[PDB]
């Protein structure tokens, strides 16, 4: 080819010491789970099938790919320090699709559609603090 597919994120040797609090991790997880139910998200659920789509040089244009499952795995492995990194990863996913395919491609409109859905949900994200009377041992 044809640049090979880069290794999966995250690097389980650089897991952050202070991850996002669980109440924030539960929210962004349910948010990503809600986006994964959207019919428009199907192409973004998993890494690109470079053989089925016949894009041998895809990883030459996109050196850092991203998908909804990777974002989900990084949350489950506590790889994020701030919820803004989850937003940045979702943005990178949309950016890669528009960069490679272009605003004319209908797959870019699917990415735009799920990004709007993601942004509507992230409006109600709880603050990084715990709450009112949540106790600390």
Residue numbers in the entry: 191 to 327
Provide the authors' original text about this structure.
BET proteins are chromatin-associated factors that regulate transcription and chromatin remodelling. BET proteins bind chromatin through their two BDs (BD1 and BD2), which specifically recognize histones acetylated on lysine residues. The BDs from C. albicans Bdf1 (CaBdf1) share 31–46% sequence identity with human BET BDs and 58–66% identity with those from ScBdf1 and hence are likely to bind multi-acetylated H3 and H4 tails. In conclusion, Bdf1 BDs are required for the viability and virulence of C. albicans and can be selectively targeted by small-molecule inhibitors without compromising human BET BD function.
To identify features differentiating the ligand-binding pockets of human and fungal BET BDs, we determined crystal structures for CaBdf1 BD1 and BD2. These structures exhibit the canonical BD fold (comprising helices Z,A,B and C, with the ZA and BC loops defining the ligand-binding pocket) and closely resemble those of their human BET counterparts (mean pairwise root-mean-square deviations (RMSDs) ≤1.5 Å; Supplementary Table 3). The ligand-binding loops are structurally well conserved, including nearly all water molecules implicated in ligand recognition, although the overall binding surfaces are less negatively charged in CaBdf1. Superimposing the CaBdf1 BD structures onto that of JQ1-bound Brd4 BD1 reveals no major steric clashes between JQ1 and the fungal BDs. However, whereas JQ1 fits snugly into the Brd4-binding pocket, the fit with the CaBdf1-binding pockets is poor. Replacement of Brd4 residue Leu94 by a Val or Ile residue further contributes to the poor fit. In addition, the p-chlorophenyl group of JQ1 occupies a groove in Brd4, which is absent (BD1) or shallower (BD2) in CaBdf1 (asterisks in Fig. 4c). A similar lack of complementarity between the ligand and binding pocket explains the insensitivity of CaBdf1 BDs towards PFI-1, IBET-151 and bromosporine. More generally, recognition of the four BETi compounds by human BET BDs involves 16 residues, including the eight signature residues previously used to classify human BD-binding sites. Five of these residues in BD1 and four in BD2 are invariant across human BET proteins but diverge in CaBdf1 (magenta arrows in Fig. 5), including the WPF-shelf Trp residue and the Leu residue opposite this shelf, at signature positions 1 and 3, respectively. Remarkably, nearly all of these residues have shorter side chains in CaBdf1 than in the human BET proteins, implying that selective CaBdf1 inhibition could conceivably be achieved via small molecules that clash sterically with the human, but not fungal, side chains.
